[PDB]
């Protein structure tokens, strides 16, 4: 290998002195090049919190039960049910036409009230967790970009500095700072059912807090705003039906279309987006191969011929049949100028080790790459 992960990412930056200030975005990576120093790949691997605090939970499908209706005749005042002043109920007061044909002395509008008990169907809740800046962890990884190893530093708000040992390449120092409103960021999940849905979504707390659904805190007996999922039928003399507004999963998933899907790995809740600013100290970085002799120019073979890296750099792989380890002779000419070298190594000291990957920058136009006496025509766009 030798740092091939960065060579694959879409968001790749090159930073080319002792310190270097970089911004590390989740899903991106940075390659640091420095004269007389090995190249380093640095990236923000994760931003997560273990066991974040739960927020309120929402009901997606109400379980409606024990519907009761009371009526009073014209002049006889309001119709009442005990369930009007109880928790876990949804009530509606209305008026019905009354007369001699339904036990009233007068013809007119009489009071009618219908109440229903409202609970949540099993496995039909939407849950949330909120982040806390004092408990977030951010993982920064460093790997030598040599082409022949990966180290991890974990940071909090309180622990901003770390020194990583890059084996034989010396030491690298990292001073990282984190940067939106974490206490206003919620990670939303739905209870699992037979259908396949994403793991979770990251939403703004104010949006999560406005969902038109019944809600409660874990452990509460009843649901608040349960009327959101109840519909009352037209009143008859003494009868008024109560209906369900149905399963809200489709409603919620439609509103979540385009919202970023987040990941949960055990007790780790991952932020979908974010960045960290680092100071990378290269003063203790040393090159490996200050003792190795030049590779025999005639013993190379193209394993993978020169190809576009996707980042306006050229990548290749060579096989070596001579004495190992050795420092690889690499150069490139502008077609028509065989004397001047126009190759700018991203892998600065390519070395064949006992059991090869070279990356270079080139000026636009017709060029010829040389890995020893192994040659290849290359046009830089």
């Amino acid at each position: 290998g030798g740092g091939s992960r960065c060579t694959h990412l879409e968001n790749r930056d090159f930073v080319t002195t002792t310190r270097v200030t970089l911004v590390l975005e989740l899903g991106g990576c940075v390659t640091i090049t420095a004269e007389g120093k090995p190249s380093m790949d640095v990236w923000l691997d994760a931003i997560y919190q273990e066991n974040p605090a739960k927020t309120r939970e929402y009901c997606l499908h109400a379980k409606l039960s024990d519907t009761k209706v009371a009526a009073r005749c014209p002049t006889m005042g309001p119709a009442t049910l005990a369930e009007e002043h109880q928790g876990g109920t949804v009530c509606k007061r209305d008026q019905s036409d009354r007369g001699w044909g339904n036990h009233c002395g007068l013809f007119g509008k009489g009071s009618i009230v219908a109440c229903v008990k409202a609970a949540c169907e099993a496995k039909k809740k939407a849950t949330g967790h909120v982040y806390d800046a004092n408990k977030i962890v951010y993982t920064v990884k460093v790997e030598p970009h040599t082409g022949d190893g990966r180290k991890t530093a974990s940071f909090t708000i309180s622990s901003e500095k770390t020194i990583l040992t890059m084996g034989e390449y010396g030491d690298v120092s990292l001073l990282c700072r984190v940067a939106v409103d974490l206490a206003q960021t919620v990670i939303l999940e739905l209870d699992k059912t037979v259908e396949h849905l994403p793991t979770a979504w990251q939403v703004h707390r104010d949006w999560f807090n406005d969902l038109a659904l019944p809600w409660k805190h874990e452990g509460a007996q009843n649901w608040n705003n349960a009327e959101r999922l109840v519909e009352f039928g037209a009143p008859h003399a003494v009868k008024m039906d109560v209906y369900n507004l149905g399963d809200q999963t489709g409603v919620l998933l439609k509103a979540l279309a385009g919202v970023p899907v987040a990941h949960i790995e055990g007790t780790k809740y991952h932020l979908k987006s974010g960045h960290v600013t680092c100071e990378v100290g290269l003063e203790k970085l040393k090159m490996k191969g200050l003792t190795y002799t030049m590779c025999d120019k005639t013993k190379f073979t193209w394993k993978r011929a020169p190809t576009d890296s996707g980042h306006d750099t050229v990548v290749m792989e060579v096989t070596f049949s001579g004495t190992k380890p050795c420092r690889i002779p690499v150069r490139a000419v502008a077609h028509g100028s065989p004397d001047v070298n126009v190759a700018m190594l991203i892998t600065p000291n390519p070395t064949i080790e006992n059991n090869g990957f070279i990356e270079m920058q080139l000026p636009p136009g017709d060029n010829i790459i040389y890995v020893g006496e192994l040659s290849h025509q290359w046009f830089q766009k």
């Binding site: 409606l64 039960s65 024990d66 519907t67 009761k68 209706v69 009371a70 009526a71 019905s96 036409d97 007369g99 001699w100 044909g101 339904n102 036990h103 008859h236 003399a237 003494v238 009868k239 039906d241 109560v242």
Partner: protein
């Protein structure tokens, strides 16, 4: 259908789908059950007044009515 007298002086007829368009005897009166959406007894229930109709009056906008018996309620589940 089954009948039960509550402690508050009320009477509760519990009916199922078989009881649709039947006439039952409650104390010294009779009640007519005409609810069309009844099923087997459960939590998914509806409970309301089974209104007493005075002698010489025709019932209006009711699917449960009584004669010669006061304070009657109907309850039915909607399962099955």
């Amino acid at each position: 259908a089954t009948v039960r007298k509550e402690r508050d002086g009320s009477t509760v007829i519990r009916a199922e789908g078989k009881d649709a368009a039947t006439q039952v005897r409650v104390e010294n009166g009779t009640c007519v059950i005409l609810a069309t959406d009844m099923g087997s007894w459960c939590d998914d229930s509806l409970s309301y007044e089974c209104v007493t109709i005075d002698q010489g009056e025709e019932p209006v906008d009711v699917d449960c009515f009584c004669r010669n018996v006061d304070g009657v309620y109907l309850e039915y589940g909607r399962c099955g």
